[PDB]
Amino acid sequence: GAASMPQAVVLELVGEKPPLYPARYAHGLFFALLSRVSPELAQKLHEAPRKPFTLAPLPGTLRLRLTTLDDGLFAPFLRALSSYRLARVLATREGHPLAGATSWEELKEAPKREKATFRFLTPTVFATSKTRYTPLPDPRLIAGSLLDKWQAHSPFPYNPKEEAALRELFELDLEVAGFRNLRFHRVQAGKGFFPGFTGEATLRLWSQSLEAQEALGRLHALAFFSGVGAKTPYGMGLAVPL
């Protein structure tokens, strides 16, 4: 088919009599709509440990944001489109600021940055195998997670030496320059519960380094689609570049 690329859409649900703590119901519903047309396709996903997507409720109307780094997978579904019914599918920025698509080429075209600010809309956490969970805006973990996602999914990965150079630059010269409205959360992400933070955080390069700045710009742009950290398929790590 045509070239795959990252995409985000916002599903607008309106409920006549909504439950008490609606966000929790994100999973049950997404599948319901998905299963309504194609019970079959819903199955592989509920079953799969291969989750090639992020799904998170936004903070009577409930908005569920879905993103993927591969266009192709949810295209048919997008074509198809309690007391919650589906009022709108917003697949454009015009429809919703958190919806839209961007090519990998465009992401690569992203302007270089000395500083990069992120708004973490849903609890965000980092998983390190020892599994340790870090619910803090560690600059190295934020950038490293984004770089992991880029290398895993981009058609334009950095080569090993570029990658290692970037990681060492991050380790050496990337600081958290500030944070705002930081809050601790503990939420269900799949079967278990995990700690995470929300709020805003700003990363800064101590360094003047073109390579690093360009990388930072690209990774900052990627976050809109990829999210940050662990459990992104389960509503966690929704991170908007500012």
**Per rule CB under 8 A, is residue 136 in the interface with a second copy?**
yes
Among 109, 162, 168, 171, binds Zn ion (CB under 5 A): 109
DSSP secondary structure code for residue 191 in this structure: T
**Residue 153: contacted member of Zn ion, a second copy, none (CB under 5 to 8 Å, by partner type):** Zn ion
Q: Which two three-digit tokens encode residue 174?
A: 């990337």
Query: Do the beta carbons of residue 215 and residue 166 sit within 8 Å?
Result: yes
Shortest reach from residue 179's CB to a second copy, in Å: 5
Query: Which residue has 């944001």 as its token pair?
Result: 65
Task: Please indicate if the annotation marks 27 as binding a ligand.
Answer: yes
Our finding on whether 172 is near a second copy (CB under 8 A) is: yes
Query: What is the C-alpha to C-alpha distance for residues 105 and 218, in angstroms, rounded to an integer?
Result: 10
Q: Residue 53 and residue 125: Cα distance in Å, rounded?
A: 17
3-state secondary structure string, 171-194? Answer: HHHEEEEEEEEEEEEEEEECCEEE
Name which of a second copy, Zn ion, none residue 137 binds, using a CB cut-off of 5 to 8 Å depending on partner kind: a second copy
Tokens found for residue 128: 């390190």
**Of these, 130, 159, 160, 192, which contacts a second copy (CB under 8 A)?**
130
141-180 positions binding Zn ion, by CB under 5 A: 152-153
Residue 189 C-beta: closest distance to a second copy, Å: 16
Known binding residue 153? Answer is yes
| Residue type at position 9 | V
Distance CA 61, CA 63 (A): 7
Phi, psi of 236, deg, nearest 5: -100, 155
Measured CA to CA, the distance from residue 237 to residue 45 in angstroms comes to 19
109 annotated as belonging to a binding site for a ligand:
yes
Give φ, ψ of 239 to 5 degrees. Answer: -130, 120
Residue 90 vs 212, nearer CB to Zn ion? 212
How far apart are the C-alpha atoms of 66 and 54, rounded to whole Å?
6
Nearer to Zn ion, 17 or 130 (CB): 130
Q: Name which position in 85, 180, 190, 242 contacts a second copy (CB under 8 A).
A: 180
- The stretch near a second copy (CB under 8 A) out of 16-24, 64-72, 82-90, 135-143 is 135-143
List the binding residues: 27, 46, 70, 109, 153, 175, 206
Binding site for Zn ion (CB under 5 A): 109, 152-153
Binding site for a second copy (CB under 8 A): 130, 132-138, 171-172, 175-180, 182-184, 186, 195
